Amino acid sequence: KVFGRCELAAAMKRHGLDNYRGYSLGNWVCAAKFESNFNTQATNRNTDGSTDYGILQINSRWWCNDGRTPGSRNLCNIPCSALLSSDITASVNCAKKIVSDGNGMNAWVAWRNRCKGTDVQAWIRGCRL
Ligand SMILES: [Cl-]
Ligand code: NA
């Protein structure tokens, strides 16, 4: 599922990500634009050989099970395939665990590098609120 911008925002707002651990909805919509271009089926290999999956590019080393990443903790209890759904619940439950854990949203290199320090309200301009 390729989400529209405001379509994604409404889905993420409905799952309570708004100011979850202190990150306004716009941070999450920005993290998805750039992690996945709003695409639930997205995958990208990483050089450690791990893969990043779903609309927030959740990584198989630490967070889901993809049957090919040494030495996987599957700290979310899930198959990575399941994060590629149209439906975003499993990805949003696991993202809530990641962002808690220590480093906040800096767990997303794309957030750091491209969202952080910006007006991330532009990402929910024009959305029914
Ligand atoms: Cl934080
Ligand atoms: Na894992």
DSSP line for the chain: -B--HHHHHHHHHHTT-TTBTTB-HHHHHHHHHHHHTTBTT-EEE-TTS-EEETTTTEETTTSSB-SS-TT---TT-SBGGGGG-SS-HHHHHHHHHHHHSSSGGGGSHHIIIIITTS-TTGGGTT---
Instruction: State the distance from the centre of ligand 2 to the C-alpha of 95, rounded, in angstroms.
Output: 14
Instruction: Please check if 101 is assigned to a binding site.
Output: yes
Cα–Cα distance for residue pair 1/50, rounded to 1 Å: 23
Into how many domains does the chain fold? 1
* Ligand that comes closest to the CA of residue 59: 2
- Please give the resolution of this entry in Å, rounded to 1 decimal: 1.5
Q: Which ligand is nearest to the CA of 20?
A: 1
Phi, psi angles (nearest 5°) of residue 66: -120, 35
The CATH number of residue 108's host domain is 1.10.530.10
Q: Comparing C-alpha atoms, which of 29, 54, 25 is closest to residue 39?
A: 54
Amino acid at 129: L
Beta strand pairing call for 51-53 and 43-45:
antiparallel
Q: How far is the CA of 57 from the centre of ligand 1 (A)?
A: 18
Residues serving a catalytic function are 35, 52
Range of the domain at 69: 1-129
Pair 96, 109: CB distance under 8 Å: no
